[PDB]
Amino acid sequence: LVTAKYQDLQENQRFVNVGLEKLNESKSLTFEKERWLNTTKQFSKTSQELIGNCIISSIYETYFGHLNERERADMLVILKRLLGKFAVKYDVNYRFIDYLVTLDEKMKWLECGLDKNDYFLENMSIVMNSQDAVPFLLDPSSHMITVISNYYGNKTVLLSFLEEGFVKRLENAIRFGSVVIIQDGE
Amino acid sequence: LIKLNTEYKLKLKNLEKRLLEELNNSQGNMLENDELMVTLNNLKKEAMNIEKKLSESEEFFPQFDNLVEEYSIIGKHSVKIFSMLEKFGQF
């Protein structure tokens, strides 16, 4: 995440500096236009806080998969206090779901059938956010598989550990790489 | 208003593309040197929209968490009602 976001801010700074140089080599009202380059200090503050912000994002993605709302809030209080113990800059007011996923993915997922609550939005964001490690869906309701298939279209297969053909069907699907969801978490 | 200012930020990004499109075209045409007047006027209108809506959003979190106090005093009793309900359920 730090690599990707530092890259992103790198091209952002390159683009704004290219715009400044272009204006340099290009009315007296351009002082109302140089706000784009006056945002360089805002970009610098985002640069100096993104390390901690990406940190807390990573703990969200990994650690917060076992915690309820109360547990998540308590862990946030603990983690922010201990950040202050090793003071590193980060915006004190910060929203997780407004930081990693844009509104486009939000309305796409909600159209798939997500419950309109912060907890499940965070859970869906973290489950579909990282692909390096396989995710573990944990819920009594089976509508999660339905909404996952909705997001994936006509690619979900219904395979179970207790099914003997699961091995053969999996060996078939792996070759052309169809998305597989297995429902035997136990 | 949250989705509104998000859309206005994307519109500002689109205006940034328009600015570059123009800067590629140089100051060769007087029409091209006068349409930027209304371009910057619309840009300032969007900027003042952003400023006014951010200012409006500034004084809402205190009101927001003042109003959540009633919902919290409701909830900390609703949870007890729930707990006793499943106490009967397990009984």
Residues A82, A83, A89, CA angle at the centre, nearest 5°?
Answer: 165
| B35/A contact by beta carbon, under 8 A | no
| B12/A contact by beta carbon, under 8 A | no
3-state class (DSSP) for residue B59: coil
Write out chain B residues lying below 8 Å of A33, CB-based.
40, 43
Exposed e or buried b per residue across B55-81, where buried means at least 16 C-beta atoms within 10 angstroms of its C-beta: eeeeeeeeeeeeeeeeeeeeeeeeeee
Residue B32's closest CA among B45, B23, B41, B44?
Answer: B23
- How far are the Cα atoms of A19, A134, B32 from residue A26, in angstroms, in the given order? 10, 52, 14
Residue to substitute from A11, A17, A27, interface B, most B β-carbons within 10 A:
A27
CA pair distance A100, A57, nearest whole angstrom:
8
Per the DSSP assignment, residues forming a β-bridge with B73 are none
3-state class (DSSP) for residue B1: coil
Write phi, then psi, for A140 (nearest 5 degrees): -80, -35
Write out chain A residues lying below 8 Å of B19, CB-based.
19
3-state class (DSSP) for residue B33: helix
Residue B5's closest CA among B63, B56, B61?
Answer: B56
CB pairs < 8 Å spanning A and B: 16
DSSP calls for chain A: -HHHHHHHHHHHHHHHHHHHHHHHT--GGGGGTTHHHHTHHHHHHHHHHHHHHHHHHHHHHHGGGS--HHHHHHHHHHHHHHHHHT-----SS--SHHHHS-HHHHHHHHHHT--SSHHHHHHHHHHHH--SS------S-SHHHHHHHHHH-TT-EEE-TT-THHHHHHHHHHHHT--EEE----
CA pair distance A99, A60, nearest whole angstrom:
11
A42 Cα distance to chain centroid: 22
Task: Indicate if the alpha-carbon torsion angle A105, A106, A107, A112 is positive or negative.
Answer: positive
3-state class (DSSP) for residue B91: coil
Contact, A166 vs A159, CB < 8 A? Answer: yes
CA pair distance B69, B75, nearest whole angstrom:
10
- How far are the Cα atoms of A50, A100, A130, B36, B91 from residue A58, in angstroms, in the given order? 12, 10, 10, 44, 42
